[PDB]
Amino acid sequence: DQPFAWQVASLSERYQEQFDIGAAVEPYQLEGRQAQILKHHYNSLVAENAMKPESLQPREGEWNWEGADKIVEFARKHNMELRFHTLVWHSQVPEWFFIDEDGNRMVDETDPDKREANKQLLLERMENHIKTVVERYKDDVTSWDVVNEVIDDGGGLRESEWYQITGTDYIKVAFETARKYGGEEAKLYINDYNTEVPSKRDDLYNLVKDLLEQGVPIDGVGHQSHIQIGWPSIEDTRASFEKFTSLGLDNQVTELDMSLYGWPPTGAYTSYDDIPAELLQAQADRYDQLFELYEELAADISSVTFWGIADNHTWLDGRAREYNNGVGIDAPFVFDHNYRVKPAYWRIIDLEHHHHH
Ligand SMILES: [Ca+2]
Ligand SMILES: [Ca+2]
Ligand SMILES: [Ca+2]
Ligand code: NI
Ligand code: NI
Numbered sequence: 001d002q003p004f005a006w007q008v009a010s011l012s013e014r015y016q017e018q019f020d021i022g023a024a025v026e027p028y029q030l031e032g033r034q035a036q037i038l039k040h041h042y043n044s045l046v047a048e049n050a051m052k053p054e055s056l057q058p059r060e061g062e063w064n065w066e067g068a069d070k071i072v073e074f075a076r077k078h079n080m081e082l083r084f085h086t087l088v089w090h091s092q093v094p095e096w097f098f099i100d101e102d103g104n105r106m107v108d109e110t111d112p113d114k115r116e117a118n119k120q121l122l123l124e125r126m127e128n129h130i131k132t133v134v135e136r137y138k139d140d141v142t143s144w145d146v147v148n149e150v151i152d153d154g155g156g157l158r159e160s161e162w163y164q165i166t167g168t169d170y171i172k173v174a175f176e177t178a179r180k181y182g183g184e185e186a187k188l189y190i191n192d193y194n195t196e197v198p199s200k201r202d203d204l205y206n207l208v209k210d211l212l213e214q215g216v217p218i219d220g221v222g223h224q225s226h227i228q229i230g231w232p233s234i235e236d237t238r239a240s241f242e243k244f245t246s247l248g249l250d251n252q253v254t255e256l257d258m259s260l261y262g263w264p265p266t267g268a269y270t271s272y273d274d275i276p277a278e279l280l281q282a283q284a285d286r287y288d289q290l291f292e293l294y295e296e297l298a299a300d301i302s303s304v305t306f307w308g309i310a311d312n313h314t315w316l317d318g319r320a321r322e323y324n325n326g327v328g329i330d331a332p333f334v335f336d337h338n339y340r341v342k343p344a345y346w347r348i349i350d351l352e353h354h355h356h357h
Contacts, residue, residue, distance in 0.1 A: 022305030090160030191222030196232035220250030257332035268320035268328030284343035310335035
């Protein structure tokens, strides 16, 4: 019978002098056992949802700070670093950004001179969003996800509304604006998933390299690390970290979780007791090797953030349900759905160093 997360040695303490250990949170998780676990095991936080653009500015000038403020106050009180997710993102983006002053959709404008006017209007709206958020939280955020998921999985840039209306200029202007109002001390990240896939890694590298050569202020790369038990490979993960280090960039692991399933997560288990112990052991073996890699590359990695706390709250549950006709759970963390430690906890708290040849 495994002990509860509040009864075992601290993860963040184990990784002192190597990297911070972070968790994604909701404001309603900052009480009770989840808050107890946060304070005991983590020294960095990120808002799972309360700081995304539609949460903060759902309508132009309608600012919703309360939930984000609660996370900031918790980080202040318990000496936790805070990442910011996220200033600019194509996902669930507030539609009002992309509507011109006549009420028409900018993406559909066919007149060239009007398209140029839309580009300037949209960039001003983006600048004002970044300015307002950075001015409020500058002294509380130590890593800014300035742009998120701007590379397409099929190659090249993601053809979101941001890209259709502004080209790459929204990326350039976002970093310049975050630097302007955050100051030279703000640490500015480009965040993405599947950064271990060589073709996507290379596209992100080529984009960031070109931007750096133009003077765009970029300090690091966020690797979301939504991974599986058998994918991606340790060697591809190593290759990706090193390539961005070669540009002088920090690496952060920003949204780590290890699904029990492939992609798509078909054939998900409908109850936690249906999970075979051998599957949690395989997860433990993989987490061991993953954090062994992180230790080897600790000079290149400033923080490792899990996209949640314990298995009772993860976006992977909704992903399982999406692909299994509305039913299904996932178990991606080192703490299980009752807050008891899993085999993976023991394998990343330990000091084992005998290799696995
Ligand atoms: Ca480090
Ligand atoms: Ca779950
Ligand atoms: Ca280990
Ligand atoms: Ni720190
Ligand atoms: Ni090992």
